[PDB]
Amino acid sequence: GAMDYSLVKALQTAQQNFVISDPSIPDNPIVYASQGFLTLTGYALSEVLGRNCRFLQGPETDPKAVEKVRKGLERGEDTTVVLLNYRKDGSTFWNQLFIAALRDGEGNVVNYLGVQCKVSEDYAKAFLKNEENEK
Ligand SMILES: Cc1cc2c(cc1C)N(C[C@H](O)[C@H](O)[C@H](O)COP(=O)(O)O)C1=NC(=O)NC(=O)[C@@H]1C2
Numbered sequence: 001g002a003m004d005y006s007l008v009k010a011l012q013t014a015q016q017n018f019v020i021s022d023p024s025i026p027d028n029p030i031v032y033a034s035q036g037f038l039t040l041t042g043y044a045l046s047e048v049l050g051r052n053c054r055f056l057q058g059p060e061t062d063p064k065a066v067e068k069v070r071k072g073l074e075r076g077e078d079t080t081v082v083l084l085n086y087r088k089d090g091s092t093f094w095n096q097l098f099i100a101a102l103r104d105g106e107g108n109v110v111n112y113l114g115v116q117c118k119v120s121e122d123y124a125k126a127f128l129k130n131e132e133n134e135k
């Protein structure tokens with residue numbers, strides 16, 4: 001299960017926000033979310049489970065950031081982005097996402113792990129300016 005991964009245990013001991021998805025199920029839904037993620041977003045665990053995490057996006061989310069995530073998942077790459085997300089009540093926050101594939105012995109992706117850090121507007125600006133300059 002989700003909490004059997006050693007890196008998940010490690011993340012828990014530091015009270016990180018994270019989610020685990022299951023890409024063997026159509027549309028790669030969330031199958032575990034940590035307490036910090038639930039508090040940050042305003043959803044109960046049961047409500048999150050079964051949703052693709054794109055449910056945190058909304059009209060002011062930059063589709064270019066979302067496309068970077070999509071392509072990373074498609075190309076088998078680790079990906080790090082900052083993008084605007086939305087809580088259950090519609091309020092917004094900047095979310096720094098760190099996503100990686102969890103693989104079996106043969107390279108098959110068996111789950112994805114995504115860590116989330118709420119970041120300040122100032123930090124998001126500077127991150128995104130750096131990303132842009134570095135393109
Ligand atoms: C393990 C994992 C963790 C996250 C996420 C995905 C995975 C697989 N995503 C990214 C979305 O679920 C999704 O991959 C992106 O929106 C790109 O796919 P698209 O919507 O098909 O373009 C998230 N998008 C978000 O906007 N907010 C988040 O908190 C999650 C973290």
Ligand SMILES: [Cl-]
Binds near residue numbers: 027028073
């Ligand atoms: Cl996805």
Ligand SMILES: [Mg+2]
Binds near residue numbers: 049050051
């Ligand atoms: Mg559910």
